[PDB]
């Protein structure tokens, strides 16, 4: 599913991401935009052989099991395919584990490079939330 910007914001809000560990909703929407262009089916292979999955591009080296990333962990305890669902619950629940891991949203390279220190509230302006 390709979300609309406000549709995604609402979904994320309902799943407890607004201000989760102090990151306002616009941060999450901004990261999704640049990670996946709001497409839950997005996948991208990394140089190390791991793959990033879903709307928030969660990596198989640490967070999910894809059966093809040797020596990896599965810290969210989920098949990576669950992250591609139109239902974002598994991505959100896993993202809450990731953002709590020490480095905050800096875990998402696109957040650090494209969202951090920008007016992220712009991503939810105009939405009914
Ligand atoms: Na893994």
CATH number (domain holding residue 104)? 1.10.530.10
CB atoms near residue 62 (< 10 Å): 17
Method: X-ray
- For 12, the domain range is 1-129
Question: In sequence order, what are the residues at sequence separation of 6 or more whose Cβ sits closer than 8 angstroms to the Cβ of residue 62?
Answer: 72, 73, 75
Nearest to 48 by CA among 56, 36, 60, 57: 60
Backbone angles phi, psi at 79, to 5 degrees: -65, 140
Give the Å distance between the CA of 102 and the centre of ligand 1.
Answer: 19
Q: Is 101 annotated as a binding residue?
A: yes
Place of tokens 């497409």: 39
Helix or strand run (H / E) with residue 31 = helix 25-36
Q: With beta carbons less than 8 A apart as the criterion, state whether 104 and 23 touch.
A: yes
Nearest to 58 by CA among 9, 97, 12: 97
Domain tally for the chain?
A: 1
In the structure encoding, which two tokens stand for residue 80, read together? 């990576």
User: How many angstroms is the resolution?
Assistant: 1.7
Known catalytic membership, residue 7: no
Task: Sheet containing 43-45: give its strands across.
Answer: 43-45, 51-53, 58-59
Question: In sequence order, what are the residues at sequence separation of 6 or more whose Cβ sits closer than 8 angstroms to the Cβ of residue 113?
Answer: none
Give the Å distance between the CA of 15 and the centre of ligand 1.
Answer: 24
In the set 52, 66, 87, 119, the catalytic residue is: 52
CB-based burial label for 95 (10 Å; 0-12, 13-18, 19+): buried
In the set 18, 35, 87, 119, the catalytic residue is: 35
Q: With beta carbons less than 8 A apart as the criterion, state whether 121 and 30 touch.
A: no
Q: With beta carbons less than 8 A apart as the criterion, state whether 109 and 118 touch.
A: no
Give the Å distance between the CA of 122 and the centre of ligand 1.
Answer: 34
Give the Å distance between the CA of 83 and the centre of ligand 1.
Answer: 13
Known catalytic membership, residue 35: yes
Place of tokens 């669902």: 85
């Amino acid at each position: 599913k390709v979300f609309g910007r406000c549709e995604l914001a609402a979904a994320m809000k309902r799943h407890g991401l607004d201000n989760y560990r102090g990151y306002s909703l616009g941060n999450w929407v901004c990261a999704a935009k640049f990670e996946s262009n709001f497409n839950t089916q997005a996948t991208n292979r990394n140089t190390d052989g791991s793959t990033d999955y879903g709307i928030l591009q969660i990596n198989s080296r640490w967070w999910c099991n894809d059966g093809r990333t040797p020596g990896s962990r599965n810290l969210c305890n989920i098949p990576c395919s669950a992250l591609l669902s139109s239902d974002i619950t598994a991505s959100v629940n896993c993202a809450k584990k990731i953002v709590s891991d020490g480095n905050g949203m800096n875990a998402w390279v696109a957040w650090r490079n494209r969202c951090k220190g920008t007016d992220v509230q712009a991503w939810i302006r105009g939405c009914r939330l």
